[PDB]
Amino acid sequence: VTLQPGPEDTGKACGVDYEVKAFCAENLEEKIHKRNSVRLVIEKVQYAPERPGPQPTAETTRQFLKPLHLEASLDKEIYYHGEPISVNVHVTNNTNKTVKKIKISVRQYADICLFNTAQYKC
Amino acid sequence: VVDPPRTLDPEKARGVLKCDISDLSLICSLGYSILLMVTCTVYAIKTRGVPETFNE
């Protein structure tokens, strides 16, 4: 995984990566010359599961100080990069209140869990 | 500056020294600090489980 760099970032990026390095030395623990060394970057990856999961659905009820009932669902659980996401919403309002705006968003969460570090959400 | 820097006799026979101000002035002065404390407590309970720098 690589975290997106900034405009002024210069050197190695942040994230987690793997590499192989082959070198020539008299002993393993003493010194590694630059001339006698070859380094290659390799990626460990995962791919989409072949079996789809259950349909994602959610429901909430909010009664104020007769409830307002919201239901939402998706069409499928596993999506591919670049494919659209369709969300179906159903709201019933028994209250005397009025919903003005409906905001729908897709959000990413990233857990850096090696040092004591906060989670990145966006 | 409105009330710049007395003897009080609560029955008995001896008068005790005091500042010119009543203690209600002290409580009114602490009125702002209590609001600060309430705001700090609300902000510290809403965050709570932040795992940074050894769960400070």
Alpha helices (H) in B1-56, listed in sequence order: 23-47
C-alpha span between A19 and A4 (Å, rounded): 20
C-alpha span between A41 and A2 (Å, rounded): 13
State the nearest Cα–Cα gap between A117 and chain B, in angstroms: 5
State the nearest Cα–Cα gap between A58 and chain B, in angstroms: 25
- CA angle A65/A70/A74 to nearest 5° reads 155
* Of A64, A109, A68, residue with least CA distance to A89: A68
- CA angle B10/B16/B19 to nearest 5° reads 105
Q: Which residues of A touch B51 (CB under 8 A)?
A: 116-118
How far, CA to CA in Å, does B47 sit from each of A122, B16, B34, B52? 18, 49, 20, 11
C-alpha span between A77 and A94 (Å, rounded): 31
B13: Cβ–Cβ under 8 A, 6 or more apart, which residues?
A: none
**A45 close to B (CB below 8 A):** no
**A122 close to B (CB below 8 A):** no
B21: Cβ–Cβ under 8 A, 6 or more apart, which residues?
A: B3
Which residue of chain A has the CA closest to B53?
A116
Task: Specify the length of chain B in residues.
Answer: 56
List the 60-119 stretch of A: residues with Cβ below 8 A of B: 116-118
CB of A13 closer than 8 Å to CB of A2:
yes
State the sign of the Cα–Cα–Cα–Cα dihedral A60, A64, A66, A68: negative
Start-to-end C-alpha separation, chain A: 16
Enter the resolution in angstroms. 3.1
Q: Which two tokens stand for residue A36?
A: 């006698």
